Ligand binder design. Sequence first.
Ligand code: 6EZ
Ligand code: CA
Ligand code: CA
Ligand code: ZN
Length: 369
Amino acid sequence: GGKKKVCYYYDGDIGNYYYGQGHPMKPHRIRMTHNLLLNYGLYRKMEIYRPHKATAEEMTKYHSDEYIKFLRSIRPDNMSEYSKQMQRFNVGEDCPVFDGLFEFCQLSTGGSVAGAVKLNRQQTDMAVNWAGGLHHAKKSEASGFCYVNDIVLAILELLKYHQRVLYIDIDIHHGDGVEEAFYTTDRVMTVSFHKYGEYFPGTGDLRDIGAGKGKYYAVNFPMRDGIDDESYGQIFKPIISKVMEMYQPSAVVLQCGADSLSGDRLGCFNLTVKGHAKCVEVVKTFNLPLLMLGGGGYTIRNVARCWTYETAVALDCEIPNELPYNDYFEYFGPDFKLHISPSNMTNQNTPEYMEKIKQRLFENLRMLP
Ligand SMILES: Nc1ccc(-c2ccc(F)cc2)cc1NC(=O)[C@@H]1C[C@H]2CC[C@@H](C1)O2
Ligand SMILES: [Ca+2]
Ligand SMILES: [Ca+2]
Ligand SMILES: [Zn+2]
């Protein structure tokens, strides 16, 4: 048990990257998160590092040479010359070309891989990179605002020193890029909780359980609109406890996508910051090397709240509900509190549904050796 060493990765340039007018991804939210947690005094309890810019050598440990070469070359001024490749690599529309795109990929990736190295060297208990968690990016394809899969790269780093790595994903969307990368291996177990049914990315059915050596090492909990703290807490600790018992990982990667929070611009879940952060508390009790990553989140005031509170949880530091003054204080009106209320939206996940899906996942976890 006990309190644990936390290393936290942040680059002050991250907030200046801009996806374009009306695009819901705001890298500014990482700066808001940073500034809020600094104003709570949480810098006093952890080591703050600036990530290196991850190289093409680092990125091509997973991604194709042609895809990384394209990301290094593509700019707003030369887009007409790469019309074929833009379509091939799924760049230009939802994943736009913007100024400094490659540098943005290098920063988000750098934090996750640096955190993994720190964990491998046994120089920290927890590593935190809120700029990471880009779980949709594929080997040779951008997807869902993600270009470079920092998570896959960080897990490959952990696999140098860890026989078994557990990946847990509480983003509202299915962690499809991470699942796909490790679908045929027992050395990574991927566990995703997500909205499923007529929803992006369209994968992560209950019946998707892995293949070959990876059969029974992919776990998917499909959910409906409006899941709440009670319903999520119903199943999270039981599932993760059973996974820990059967799989026995030596390192953990937790993707903490904040688009599962109540009031998210794109999401349809109803979790509070406390309900979301209960997942961090559950994972942290197992006392394994832990990489905590960001993810989605489009109501940026709540993203800042969520990841500030989850940093406090990682540190075992109680922080007051009254928000301290900060550079983005006006974003947190009209209440200026840390914690959020759930909406009155209907929870389409019945208690019977939650128990039934849990029981079917328990059947699959019995098939581990
Ligand atoms: N899930 C996720 C996780 C991380 C990042 C992400 C991407 C780049 C970053 F620098 C940091 C985080 C994005 C998503 N993308 C979504 O949530 C969108 C997927 C599609 C398109 C609109 C809607 C929402 O459906
Ligand atoms: Ca998920
Ligand atoms: Ca697997
Ligand atoms: Zn998401």
